[PDB]
């Protein structure tokens, strides 16, 4: 007749003992399940639903959109405890990464233990990028992970950090508390962040002054929320700050948030940042009861989140699925109320713009372009790692002056600005200013400063394939150009030549036909490839 | 709103997405995940409807947009139609060879063919299996094109929360409860999503085979309506020469494009081979003193009937009754009685269950119809339940509530001991030991006055006896009955408050209540609340209980009972028996008759003779055993005109072919106030036929010569005495279909509101009723 409620209630109650039940808080009994026990099993489902009064369908739903919570019935098999992860995508791929999956998955792949796959973590810079039961490693090879297992080293481990106390030493707090007293007012934030130009982060290219009065406009009980997935593959920005001084993005975003008069706010970032994931518990109780409560949540994969409608149904408690662009977010957003997006790292500057002013935010760009930004290098380089930089800059120039230069032992043929979402151009396309506005008219852009470098020894076809494989796994699921043009063209890239036509007519299609900013984007490689690779058909 | 389109400078209404001004317009273009069909809503998923417009970059859809003032939309050019060629061609790489696969003939294979498309040029996909665990319906689900429709209709208008999608992209599918086979999963064979899947992937039965393939087509059509609930929802029954198949919904005033296993299925009980055709007066094939004829076995019923009244007199006569499944029979199966026994021991064993509401209702207001219908519970705020159980027995007014629940949050309340199923969507659930309700009914009942929350001015001049009552009120209290219903107080003052303070609210219950003993006394209370505060008569506001039957409304308000002719004047009265004579013209009796348990007894070692049953299994419904045999054994002269041969008059001395429902026209009606028209699908088997030949040859072989001809005059003569049609005609009962009778204009939809402007008694004012605790 239907699923039954089963005696095992008990282990249910007895441990999320005094907690709430709204459907907006989750996630967050799923994580919970996930770690006490290995697996998440259809009665303890049940139980949980049928105390939260709900159908099954929904909690089925949810549970596997994510790609890391893992569900088996009364008929599968156990899951084991211990597991393992390796990085697929093109930086982690490029160091040698298949011939680790399936060289290590018939040493320890028995039943004790267990080795998958996962697209990307964060960590392009120290090429492998595996992890053991969140812990991390770092030119992973085979005869460290058997001592890492051998030994119960799945936990983490944590490094050294600037502390409230540290922090209050210096500035300190002290530009916020001018806030909630008169001897600063508000119009003057808005001023210097409009006549200083801060051209907000993330893959959109756009103002915050505007943002900001906007979100100030309309009424009501206001939001907002921090976007902290940076799931982007070339994208390792945000670990190297969070784990260095956060207490500057938690005041950038206090600060954010009392201009908007937002009560609470929000946060969330990756499952595959466990680091920052303790160092801001750490923190935030020893910040004070002042009078702005914040949050913070989890995030188990689901790419689809970067974006703004999806994170904001999974603060929710929902599906993972966007929403449609002429109604607003700003406008409509958490809960049918408006709120402000701002990636962690356009709050970590805000300070030294008040501080010092905009001037300081304008003696900087090198070319025409005016601004500073802080890149993200990576591939075969001779010192990669994040990058502080005047906007603007070439890419040689990057590559000579900052990165130490590329290696000895390659060459330079090609490279690929803007990540995965960006398109893979030659070397020719060397006198480019990498800024926003400057790359549309050339097919590709720069959203993420994801930046790589490929060499001759390199071949850029597979390059696509494992993108498009990846903009496989990742698309959400709703709209159909995503779901089927990825698996045509997954297909089409494999035989040993491809049309290029039917690749041109589909592409054209999936962007300009697309619900999601990233169906609109899933072909700018391969499109870019037939424009500026034509030696290679 | 003027905005130019296609190269045009057009108008459009508001809320008019561009597809419906295409539509309205003439530009008719492909949808596929867009169903028109009010009740659903659009998602934008497929991005088949695509559009272009002067100041976007990106292609726009038409299903789920709006045309504001200056914007141009764009339709006959490049773009676009390159983009729907392009997703028509994936959607048929990945699906099978429309040749010979399900539902050939179908939604998608035909928007396809508008664009142009009869192959792709890309591979296929290797996709799941099916499954038919579930006996009606068939998934062999390899031609989903993600078009949650499945969804809309079984987690948005009936809701069962069953269907969802539980994967990612690739493989996303749609999934039952926990990935189960759907054999077993929550289902409920609500065909709602049978009928929404464009493709014939979630495809019944009877249009397929093991080859799982379209193998029919519609041989043809006929709009009709369901004969086992009170609700009348429409039907469009499909069927093959001599077979009926398999049902879908009609826009019906009353219905909306949805019903419940039986709208779909279960109708094995008219094509049942194991029948009656023939006179047959133990197992089930008959094999005794059966005699095929139609002139000899009538003799045996006029002639017996008339002779017996001749040799023992009128009241030694009696007759039960039956509304199953028509209205006008039941005014000539009155009128027979009244006019050839010259006598009123008519009576009705179906309108026994929910008697004492309309006792309650006809003492306070005059009346037995609930105030307001069940569809009006989208405009309201609040809601009131006890004693039933929807979601079972009357499920799409369940749904219609489980829908206002989501859209407008109007919270509900329950009273049952039992846990019930909406409990889930219930705001509250109050258990209580059972014959107790009547305690915290006055509760509720003296909560408002007693703190002074009531709205004083509508019991100023509109309910009466507001005052005599109040020593016993200001004596009961709401605090008291604790250990004596089962609850707590406070929940009580909230549940009060709620009401009282409610813009609107109504109340539902079933035979739940009525059945006890004094469930009389039960409503003598409930009656006023909505009098007692005033939501009642306006908008939204009202009274309604429910009926577990499909015309005992259009039964027992025409005639068919022991104590009334019809539409409610009583025969006890004296001018009644003066004026329906210039029809009948006959001479009446004006003692009541002896009502169904009454004559049951009294025949009893009394003096009643034989009878005229009709539709009904009399043996097995009221009484357990005393009153099933030695009912009937006792009997002399007995008659039986059941369909088949059920348990009831084994020994019945004659018997004849009673019709069976789908084939007739005439007249029903709901416990909604309104009267469905219905029309024949199919003729029955052997020399059978419908019973108003049968009462009407009777009656001839009874010297009574109406010789009135078929329902359409029988229409006409039953509403030239009942004022209740006073505006109203078979020619707009079967155009415009159904109506209601409240209606005073020709060519208006309706008065469909008790009491909007005062009650229909002579007072204008009710009596509100001395409620006690009297057990
Ligand atoms: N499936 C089906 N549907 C039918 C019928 C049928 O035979 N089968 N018949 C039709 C007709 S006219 C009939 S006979 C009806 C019968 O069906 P209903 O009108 O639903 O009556 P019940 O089915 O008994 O549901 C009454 C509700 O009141 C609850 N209840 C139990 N005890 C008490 C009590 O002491 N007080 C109160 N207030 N509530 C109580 C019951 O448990 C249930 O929740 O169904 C109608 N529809
Ligand atoms: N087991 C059980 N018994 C009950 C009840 C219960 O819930 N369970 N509830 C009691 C109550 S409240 C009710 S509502 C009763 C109802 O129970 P019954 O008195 O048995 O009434 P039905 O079961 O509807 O049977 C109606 C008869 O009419 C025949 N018939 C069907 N269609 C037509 C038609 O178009 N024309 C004619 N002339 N005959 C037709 C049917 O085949 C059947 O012979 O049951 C009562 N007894
Ligand atoms: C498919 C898609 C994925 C995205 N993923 C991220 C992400 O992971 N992190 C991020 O900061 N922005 C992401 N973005 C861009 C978001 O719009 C961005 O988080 C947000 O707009 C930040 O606003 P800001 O520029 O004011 O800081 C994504 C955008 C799209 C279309
Ligand atoms: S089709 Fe692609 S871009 Fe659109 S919602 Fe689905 S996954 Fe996202
Ligand atoms: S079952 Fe019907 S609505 Fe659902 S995906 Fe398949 S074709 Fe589309
Ligand atoms: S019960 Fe009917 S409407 Fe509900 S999911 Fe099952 S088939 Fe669809
Ligand atoms: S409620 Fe009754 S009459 Fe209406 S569709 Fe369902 S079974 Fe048929
Ligand atoms: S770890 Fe492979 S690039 Fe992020
Ligand atoms: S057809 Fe309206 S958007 Fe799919
Ligand atoms: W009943």
């Given at each position: 007749?239907?699923?039954?409620?089963?005696?095992?209630?008990?282990?249910?109650?007895?441990?999320?003992?005094?907690?709430?039940?709204?459907?907006?808080?989750?996630?967050?009994?799923?994580?919970?399940?996930?770690?006490?026990?290995?697996?998440?099993?259809?009665?303890?489902?049940?139980?949980?639903?049928?105390?939260?009064?709900?159908?099954?369908?929904?909690?089925?739903?949810?549970?596997?959109?994510?790609?890391?919570?893992?569900?088996?019935?009364?008929?599968?098999?156990?899951?084991?405890?211990?597991?393992?992860?390796?990085?697929?995508?093109?930086?982690?791929?490029?160091?040698?990464?298949?011939?680790?999956?399936?060289?290590?998955?018939?040493?320890?792949?028995?039943?004790?233990?267990?080795?998958?796959?996962?697209?990307?973590?964060?960590?392009?810079?120290?090429?492998?990028?595996?992890?053991?039961?969140?812990?991390?490693?770092?030119?992973?090879?085979?005869?460290?992970?058997?001592?890492?297992?051998?030994?119960?080293?799945?936990?983490?481990?944590?490094?050294?950090?600037?502390?409230?106390?540290?922090?209050?030493?210096?500035?300190?707090?002290?530009?916020?508390?001018?806030?909630?007293?008169?001897?600063?007012?508000?119009?003057?934030?808005?001023?210097?962040?409009?006549?200083?130009?801060?051209?907000?982060?993330?893959?959109?290219?756009?103002?915050?002054?505007?943002?900001?009065?906007?979100?100030?406009?309309?009424?009501?009980?206001?939001?907002?929320?921090?976007?902290?997935?940076?799931?982007?593959?070339?994208?390792?920005?945000?670990?190297?700050?969070?784990?260095?001084?956060?207490?500057?993005?938690?005041?950038?975003?206090?600060?954010?948030?009392?201009?908007?008069?937002?009560?609470?706010?929000?946060?969330?970032?990756?499952?595959?940042?466990?680091?920052?994931?303790?160092?801001?518990?750490?923190?935030?109780?020893?910040?004070?009861?002042?009078?702005?409560?914040?949050?913070?949540?989890?995030?188990?994969?689901?790419?689809?989140?970067?974006?703004?409608?999806?994170?904001?149904?999974?603060?929710?408690?929902?599906?993972?699925?966007?929403?449609?662009?002429?109604?607003?977010?700003?406008?409509?957003?958490?809960?049918?109320?408006?709120?402000?997006?701002?990636?962690?790292?356009?709050?970590?500057?805000?300070?030294?713009?008040?501080?010092?002013?905009?001037?300081?935010?304008?003696?900087?760009?090198?070319?025409?372009?005016?601004?500073?930004?802080?890149?993200?290098?990576?591939?075969?380089?001779?010192?990669?790692?994040?990058?502080?930089?005047?906007?603007?800059?070439?890419?040689?120039?990057?590559?000579?002056?900052?990165?130490?230069?590329?290696?000895?032992?390659?060459?330079?043929?090609?490279?690929?600005?803007?990540?995965?979402?960006?398109?893979?151009?030659?070397?020719?396309?060397?006198?480019?200013?990498?800024?926003?506005?400057?790359?549309?008219?050339?097919?590709?852009?720069?959203?993420?400063?994801?930046?790589?470098?490929?060499?001759?020894?390199?071949?850029?076809?597979?390059?696509?394939?494992?993108?498009?494989?990846?903009?496989?796994?990742?698309?959400?699921?709703?709209?159909?150009?995503?779901?089927?043009?990825?698996?045509?063209?997954?297909?089409?890239?494999?035989?040993?030549?491809?049309?290029?036509?039917?690749?041109?007519?589909?592409?054209?299609?999936?962007?300009?036909?697309?619900?999601?900013?990233?169906?609109?984007?899933?072909?700018?490689?391969?499109?870019?490839?037939?424009?500026?690779?034509?030696?290679?058909? | 709103?003027?905005?130019?389109?296609?190269?045009?400078?057009?108008?459009?209404?508001?809320?008019?997405?561009?597809?419906?001004?295409?539509?309205?317009?003439?530009?008719?273009?492909?949808?596929?995940?867009?169903?028109?069909?009010?009740?659903?809503?659009?998602?934008?998923?497929?991005?088949?409807?695509?559009?272009?417009?002067?100041?976007?970059?990106?292609?726009?859809?038409?299903?789920?947009?709006?045309?504001?003032?200056?914007?141009?939309?764009?339709?006959?050019?490049?773009?676009?139609?390159?983009?729907?060629?392009?997703?028509?061609?994936?959607?048929?790489?990945?699906?099978?060879?429309?040749?010979?696969?399900?539902?050939?003939?179908?939604?998608?294979?035909?928007?396809?063919?508008?664009?142009?498309?009869?192959?792709?040029?890309?591979?296929?996909?290797?996709?799941?299996?099916?499954?038919?665990?579930?006996?009606?319906?068939?998934?062999?689900?390899?031609?989903?094109?993600?078009?949650?429709?499945?969804?809309?209709?079984?987690?948005?208008?009936?809701?069962?929360?069953?269907?969802?999608?539980?994967?990612?992209?690739?493989?996303?599918?749609?999934?039952?409860?926990?990935?189960?086979?759907?054999?077993?999963?929550?289902?409920?064979?609500?065909?709602?999503?049978?009928?929404?899947?464009?493709?014939?992937?979630?495809?019944?039965?009877?249009?397929?085979?093991?080859?799982?393939?379209?193998?029919?087509?519609?041989?043809?059509?006929?709009?009709?309506?369901?004969?086992?609930?009170?609700?009348?929802?429409?039907?469009?029954?499909?069927?093959?020469?001599?077979?009926?198949?398999?049902?879908?919904?009609?826009?019906?005033?009353?219905?909306?494009?949805?019903?419940?296993?039986?709208?779909?299925?279960?109708?094995?009980?008219?094509?049942?081979?194991?029948?009656?055709?023939?006179?047959?007066?133990?197992?089930?094939?008959?094999?005794?003193?059966?005699?095929?004829?139609?002139?000899?076995?009538?003799?045996?019923?006029?002639?017996?009937?008339?002779?017996?009244?001749?040799?023992?007199?009128?009241?030694?006569?009696?007759?039960?009754?039956?509304?199953?499944?028509?209205?006008?029979?039941?005014?000539?199966?009155?009128?027979?009685?009244?006019?050839?026994?010259?006598?009123?021991n008519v009576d009705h064993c179906t309108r026994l269950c929910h008697a004492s509401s309309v006792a309650a209702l006809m003492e306070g207001l005059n009346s037995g119809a609930v105030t307001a219908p069940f569809s009006?519970?989208?405009?309201?705020?609040?809601?009131?339940?006890?004693?039933?159980?929807?979601?079972?027995?009357?499920?799409?007014?369940?749904?219609?509530?489980?829908?206002?629940?989501?859209?407008?949050?109007?919270?509900?309340?329950?009273?049952?001991?039992?846990?019930?199923?909406?409990?889930?969507?219930?705001?509250?659930?109050?258990?209580?030991?059972?014959?107790?309700?009547?305690?915290?009914?006055?509760?509720?009942?003296?909560?408002?006055?007693?703190?002074?929350?009531?709205?004083?001015?509508?019991?100023?001049?509109?309910?009466?006896?507001?005052?005599?009552?109040?020593?016993?009120?200001?004596?009961?209290?709401?605090?008291?009955?604790?250990?004596?219903?089962?609850?707590?107080?406070?929940?009580?003052?909230?549940?009060?408050?709620?009401?009282?303070?409610?813009?609107?609210?109504?109340?539902?219950?079933?035979?739940?209540?009525?059945?006890?003993?004094?469930?009389?006394?039960?409503?003598?209370?409930?009656?006023?609340?909505?009098?007692?505060?005033?939501?009642?008569?306006?908008?939204?506001?009202?009274?309604?209980?429910?009926?577990?039957?499909?015309?005992?409304?259009?039964?027992?308000?025409?005639?068919?009972?022991?104590?009334?002719?019809?539409?409610?004047?009583?025969?006890?009265?004296?001018?009644?028996?003066?004026?329906?004579?210039?029809?009948?013209?006959?001479?009446?009796?004006?003692?009541?008759?002896?009502?169904?348990?009454?004559?049951?007894?009294?025949?009893?070692?009394?003096?009643?003779?034989?009878?005229?049953?009709?539709?009904?299994?009399?043996?097995?419904?009221?009484?357990?055993?005393?009153?099933?045999?030695?009912?009937?054994?006792?009997?002399?002269?007995?008659?039986?005109?059941?369909?088949?041969?059920?348990?009831?008059?084994?020994?019945?001395?004659?018997?004849?072919?009673?019709?069976?429902?789908?084939?007739?026209?005439?007249?029903?009606?709901?416990?909604?106030?309104?009267?469905?028209?219905?029309?024949?699908?199919?003729?029955?088997?052997?020399?059978?036929?419908?019973?108003?030949?049968?009462?009407?040859?009777?009656?001839?072989?009874?010297?009574?010569?109406?010789?009135?001809?078929?329902?359409?005059?029988?229409?006409?003569?039953?509403?030239?005495?009942?004022?209740?049609?006073?505006?109203?005609?078979?020619?707009?009962?079967?155009?415009?279909?159904?109506?209601?009778?409240?209606?005073?204009?020709?060519?208006?939809?309706?008065?469909?509101?008790?009491?909007?402007?005062?009650?229909?008694?002579?007072?204008?004012?009710?009596?509100?009723?001395?409620?006690?605790?009297?057990?």
């Amino acid at each position: 007749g239907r699923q039954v409620d089963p005696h095992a209630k008990v282990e249910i109650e007895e441990l999320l003992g005094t907690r709430p039940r709204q459907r907006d808080l989750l996630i967050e009994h799923l994580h919970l399940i996930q770690d006490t026990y290995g697996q998440i099993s259809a009665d303890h489902l049940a139980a949980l639903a049928d105390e939260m009064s709900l159908a099954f369908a929904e909690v089925f739903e949810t549970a596997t959109f994510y790609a890391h919570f893992d569900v088996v019935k009364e008929g599968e098999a156990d899951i084991p405890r211990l597991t393992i992860r390796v990085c697929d995508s093109i930086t982690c791929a490029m160091f040698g990464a298949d011939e680790l999956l399936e060289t290590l998955q018939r040493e320890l792949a028995s039943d004790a233990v267990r080795v998958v796959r996962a697209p990307c973590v964060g960590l392009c810079d120290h090429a492998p990028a595996v992890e053991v039961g969140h812990n991390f490693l770092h030119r992973a090879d085979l005869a460290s992970v058997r001592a890492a297992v051998e030994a119960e080293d799945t936990h983490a481990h944590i490094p050294t950090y600037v502390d409230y106390d540290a922090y209050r030493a210096g500035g300190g707090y002290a530009t916020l508390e001018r806030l909630r007293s008169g001897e600063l007012p508000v119009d003057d934030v808005l001023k210097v962040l409009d006549d200083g130009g801060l051209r907000g982060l993330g893959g959109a290219g756009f103002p915050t002054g505007r943002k900001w009065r906007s979100v100030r406009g309309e009424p009501g009980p206001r939001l907002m929320a921090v976007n902290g997935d940076e799931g982007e593959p070339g994208t390792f920005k945000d670990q190297l700050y969070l784990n260095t001084d956060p207490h500057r993005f938690l005041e950038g975003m206090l600060i954010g948030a009392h201009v908007v008069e937002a009560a609470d706010v929000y946060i969330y970032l990756r499952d595959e940042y466990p680091i920052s994931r303790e160092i801001l518990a750490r923190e935030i109780a020893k910040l004070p009861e002042g009078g702005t409560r914040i949050h913070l949540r989890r995030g188990a994969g689901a790419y689809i989140c970067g974006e703004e409608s999806s994170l904001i149904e999974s603060l929710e408690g929902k599906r993972g699925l966007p929403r449609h662009k002429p109604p607003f977010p700003f406008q409509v957003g958490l809960f049918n109320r408006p709120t402000l997006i701002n990636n962690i790292e356009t709050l970590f500057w805000v300070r030294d713009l008040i501080e010092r002013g905009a001037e300081w935010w304008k003696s900087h760009g090198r070319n025409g372009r005016v601004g500073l930004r802080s890149y993200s290098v990576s591939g075969r380089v001779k010192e990669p790692g994040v990058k502080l930089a005047p906007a603007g800059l070439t890419i040689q120039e990057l590559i000579d002056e900052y990165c130490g230069g590329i290696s000895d032992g390659h060459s330079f043929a090609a490279y690929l600005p803007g990540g995965a979402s960006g398109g893979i151009l030659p070397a020719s396309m060397n006198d480019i200013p990498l800024d926003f506005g400057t790359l549309e008219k050339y097919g590709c852009f720069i959203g993420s400063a994801a930046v790589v470098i490929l060499s001759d020894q390199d071949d850029v076809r597979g390059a696509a394939l494992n993108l498009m494989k990846f903009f496989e796994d990742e698309s959400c699921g709703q709209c159909t150009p995503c779901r089927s043009g990825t698996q045509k063209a997954r297909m089409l890239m494999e035989n040993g030549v491809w049309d290029t036509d039917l690749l041109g007519e589909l592409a054209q299609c999936m962007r300009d036909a697309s619900i999601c900013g990233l169906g609109q984007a899933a072909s700018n490689p391969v499109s870019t490839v037939i424009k500026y690779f034509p030696d290679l058909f | 709103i003027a905005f130019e389109f296609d190269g045009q400078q057009v108008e459009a209404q508001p809320g008019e997405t561009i597809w419906a001004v295409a539509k309205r317009l003439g530009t008719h273009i492909p949808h596929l995940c867009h169903k028109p069909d009010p009740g659903y809503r659009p998602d934008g998923n497929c991005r088949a409807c695509m559009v272009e417009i002067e100041g976007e970059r990106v292609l726009a859809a038409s299903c789920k947009r709006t045309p504001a003032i200056g914007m141009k939309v764009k339709s006959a050019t490049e773009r676009a139609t390159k983009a729907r060629a392009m997703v028509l061609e994936l959607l048929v790489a990945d699906q099978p060879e429309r040749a010979t696969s399900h539902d050939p003939s179908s939604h998608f294979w035909v928007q396809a063919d508008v664009l142009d498309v009869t192959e792709s040029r890309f591979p296929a996909a290797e996709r799941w299996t099916s499954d038919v665990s579930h006996p009606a319906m068939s998934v062999n689900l390899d031609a989903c094109i993600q078009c949650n429709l499945c969804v809309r209709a079984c987690r948005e208008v009936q809701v069962n929360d069953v269907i969802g999608m539980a994967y990612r992209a690739a493989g996303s599918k749609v999934v039952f409860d926990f990935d189960d086979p759907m054999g077993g999963s929550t289902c409920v064979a609500c065909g709602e999503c049978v009928q929404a899947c464009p493709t014939g992937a979630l495809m019944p039965a009877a249009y397929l085979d093991a080859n799982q393939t379209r193998t029919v087509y519609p041989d043809r059509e006929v709009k009709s309506l369901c004969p086992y609930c009170g609700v009348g929802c429409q039907v469009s029954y499909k069927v093959k020469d001599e077979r009926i198949v398999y049902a879908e919904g009609v826009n019906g005033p009353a219905n909306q494009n949805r019903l419940c296993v039986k709208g779909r299925f279960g109708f094995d009980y008219v094509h049942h081979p194991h029948r009656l055709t023939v006179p047959l007066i133990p197992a089930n094939p008959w094999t005794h003193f059966r005699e095929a004829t139609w002139e000899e076995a009538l003799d045996r019923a006029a002639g017996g009937l008339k002779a017996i009244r001749d040799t023992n007199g009128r009241k030694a006569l009696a007759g039960f009754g039956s509304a199953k499944g028509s209205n006008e029979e039941a005014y000539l199966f009155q009128k027979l009685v009244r006019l050839g026994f010259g006598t009123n021991n008519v009576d009705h064993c179906t309108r026994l269950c929910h008697a004492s509401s309309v006792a309650a209702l006809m003492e306070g207001l005059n009346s037995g119809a609930v105030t307001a219908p069940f569809s009006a519970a989208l405009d309201a705020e609040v809601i009131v339940v006890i004693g039933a159980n929807p979601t079972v027995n009357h499920p799409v007014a369940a749904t219609f509530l489980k829908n206002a629940v989501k859209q407008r949050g109007a919270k509900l309340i329950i009273m049952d001991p039992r846990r019930q199923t909406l409990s889930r969507h219930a705001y509250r659930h109050l258990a209580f030991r059972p014959g107790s309700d009547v305690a915290m009914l006055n509760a509720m009942l003296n909560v408002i006055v007693t703190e002074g929350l009531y709205d004083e001015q509508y019991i100023a001049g509109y309910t009466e006896n507001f005052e005599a009552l109040r020593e016993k009120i200001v004596d009961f209290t709401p605090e008291k009955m604790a250990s004596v219903c089962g609850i707590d107080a406070e929940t009580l003052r909230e549940v009060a408050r709620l009401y009282a303070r409610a813009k609107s609210s109504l109340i539902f219950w079933g035979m739940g209540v009525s059945q006890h003993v004094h469930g009389t006394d039960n409503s003598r209370c409930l009656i006023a609340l909505a009098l007692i505060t005033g939501q009642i008569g306006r908008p939204g506001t009202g009274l309604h209980p429910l009926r577990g039957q499909n015309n005992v409304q259009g039964a027992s308000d025409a005639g068919l009972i022991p104590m009334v002719y019809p539409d409610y004047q009583s025969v006890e009265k004296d001018a009644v028996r003066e004026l329906f004579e210039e029809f009948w013209g006959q001479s009446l009796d004006p003692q009541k008759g002896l009502t169904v348990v009454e004559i049951m007894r009294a025949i009893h070692a009394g003096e009643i003779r034989g009878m005229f049953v009709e539709g009904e299994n009399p043996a097995m419904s009221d009484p357990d055993l005393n009153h099933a045999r030695h009912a009937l054994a006792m009997l002399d002269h007995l008659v039986v005109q059941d369909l088949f041969l059920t348990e009831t008059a084994f020994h019945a001395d004659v018997v004849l072919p009673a019709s069976a429902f789908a084939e007739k026209a005439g007249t029903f009606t709901n416990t909604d106030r309104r009267v469905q028209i219905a029309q024949p699908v199919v003729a029955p088997p052997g020399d059978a036929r419908q019973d108003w030949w049968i009462i009407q040859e009777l009656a001839r072989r009874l010297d009574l010569d109406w010789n009135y001809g078929g329902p359409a005059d029988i229409f006409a003569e039953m509403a030239q005495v009942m004022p209740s049609l006073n505006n109203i005609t078979w020619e707009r009962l079967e155009r415009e279909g159904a109506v209601t009778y409240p209606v005073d204009a020709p060519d208006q939809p309706g008065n469909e509101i008790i009491f909007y402007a005062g009650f229909p008694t002579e007072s204008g004012r009710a009596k509100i009723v001395p409620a006690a605790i009297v057990p």
